[PDB]
Design a protein around this nucleic acid. Structure first.
Ligand code: ZN
Ligand code: ZN
Ligand code: ZN
Ligand code: ZN
Lengths: 195, 198, 197, 197
DNA sequence: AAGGCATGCC
DNA sequence: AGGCATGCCTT
DNA sequence: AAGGCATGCCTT
DNA sequence: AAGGCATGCCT
């Protein structure tokens, strides 16, 4: 099967927010509204903001999961490539083969789905700090979109799911991702190609 | 290391908690504690008084352990140790091994431990009742690298976890505080408290 | 792993030299040799003819071994092998182990060695004297990763070392050449020669 | 004792030239004529030019050595700090303890002096490439001047000696070095400090 | 690149 | 100690 | 197949 | 930082 990518704001009015960081050639992470697509560097901080209109009950969780965007690849599990899965870059919390990690959260939980084989990463939902209007999660993507024998130049979507403590769905959003060496340059290229 | 210790405050059955002197915020005061951040700012090798408060005295053989861990989860599995320079300095107090970040000063019964499973350093003294007239037990800690030390803490913040333990080493109580070991404790304290309010 | 095998040229008693076809320099020529660099430029999995020239014929049972090594000293002790991706590729020729960078095509008497003491890989075939009117023996090698493969040669130059050896594995002669396995052998040879002068 | 730092051109007219790289904040390497001082980043290329009026014999060598500049530190051997000594920054040729390396010269040699324990790096002298008038060596400095447990904010000199094959001196030149994060910034600051208001 | 600031030292 | 010495971040 | 582009990385 | 270049892939 294929996990749903249907936007669902749900009862908490759950939306995603991004930092608008421009298009300098090698900016670490930038987001393109035209494309609803994140462009980021391998292993670097990728902030994603969680915006809600009302606070979810305690025990709420936030899951991220990658799937290939193109229909002919959707059934293939998105994983790190054979080279990077073997690299010495463990943070001591994440599985070597998971593409998406969360950094900065000791309560992070990774899953290898026993039936789908799909990887995901889950953290508990915490409301914004005082004064803040949104909750920021810092993701890292641990292969380039180009990785031979991994994503192998295929676009992926990251699906962000808000879940109750047992995994029932409360909210869903998604964005496309390109992990590459030069996010600003590649953001500009894809955008210009869209004209 | 492959695991991390708890930082969960645990008063336990003796009502265990920590107390800190009120100190300056003068640029380079040798040790100053921020209640807003629950964070100690201090200079390398300078006295850090930490007060132990209990509601009733624990049994003889009770011990007090201090251990350092990285605050950031992405570094938390890594053992906090001295940098290559300071490890090789000739600054022993007579008992402390050269690789240990935290020393206790002024106590003959101090012991330094390397965990053989976790590899983690800690320093442990026997627990003493507060002196006659006093309400708490003051221990004098030192930190033997700056937070900035290259090849050591390397600008990564740490927490010090203080545990009350029985003689076999089971937990009686736990508290913790962040530490920055820096050149200008008063300056840095204020900078960080200012940042809170932004 | 282990120490570096000698790369010293040793023509020996049989006058052992190598020779290479005088190929193209068009962008993506499958295989081209630069006399100036003593360097082959070739594509992944494409035929790389290598000529054996001896002044005098080696005895029955002589064998021809090739083995790759990193050119550079910091890299010399590391075994040249295929990157994790290509090693797990379904590209067997039926005979070569999947980790081996260097294959021989067209030769059912090929053997592949995983050296138990050095961990180094090599591929060896029986020596055959030239046929009739031919002045050399040609072996067709294939290189199964690009020089650039991350997790493998990772942009680090290699040498291939061809040894002539007796039926017992004793050295008879030795030659070597540098290799770059890349997408566009012609372009990259031009570039590299250009940069030399 | 302390090695001599006194400049002399000697019989080959031996002198150093530097590149004039300007003072942008983060320029890799830049040189101050007014200070006879090179400002450079840790581990980056520092080009140093050898100029001679006549060609010394082959077997002629060019050695580089750091000493502390201040008279009270002079007798202390200049070395990397414990942290950088330990880092994984090896080129496979240089000893981990040596501040000064030569990059891009496979003939480099390092010395630990048996009497003084001072470090040095030496390369054969080679004549200018045809159509050029000087020989360039690429030095790397492998600690910052500010490195705690190494130079610890003490200025140093590099002494470049032209030597015959016995190590007899043919020519000497020296210059101050500051290894720092922002050479351009720091050269500016230091030259501004030469001024009277 | 080159603004911004962290952090040692005076 | 405000002012500087000097490192490292990201872009 | 030369020309153009995709895309990682180094330089300053 | 954008420029430049290494180096795979394509039309
Ligand atoms: Zn990868
Ligand atoms: Zn230290
Ligand atoms: Zn490969
Ligand atoms: Zn250093």
């Amino acid at each position: 099967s294929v996990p749903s990518q249907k936007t669902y704001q749900g009862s908490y009015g759950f939306r995603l927010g991004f930092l608008h960081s421009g298009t300098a050639k090698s900016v670490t992470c930038t987001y393109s509204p035209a494309l609803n697509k994140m462009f980021c560097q391998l292993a670097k901080t990728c902030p994603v903001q969680l915006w809600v209109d009302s606070t979810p009950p305690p025990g709420t969780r936030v899951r991220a999961m990658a799937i290939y965007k193109q229909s002919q690849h959707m059934t293939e599990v998105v994983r790190r490539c054979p080279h990077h899965e073997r690299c010495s870059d463990s943070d001591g919390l994440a599985p070597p083969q998971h593409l998406i990690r969360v950094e900065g959260n000791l309560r992070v939980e990774y899953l290898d789905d026993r039936n789908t084989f799909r990887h995901s990463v889950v953290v508990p939902y915490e409301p914004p700090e005082v004064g803040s209007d949104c909750t920021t999660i810092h993701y890292n993507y641990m292969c380039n979109s180009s990785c031979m024998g991994g994503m192998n130049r295929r676009p992926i979507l990251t699906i962000i799911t808000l879940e109750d403590s047992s995994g029932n769905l409360l909210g869903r959003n998604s964005f496309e991702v390109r992990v590459c060496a030069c996010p600003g340059r590649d953001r500009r290229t894809e955008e210009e190609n869209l004209r």
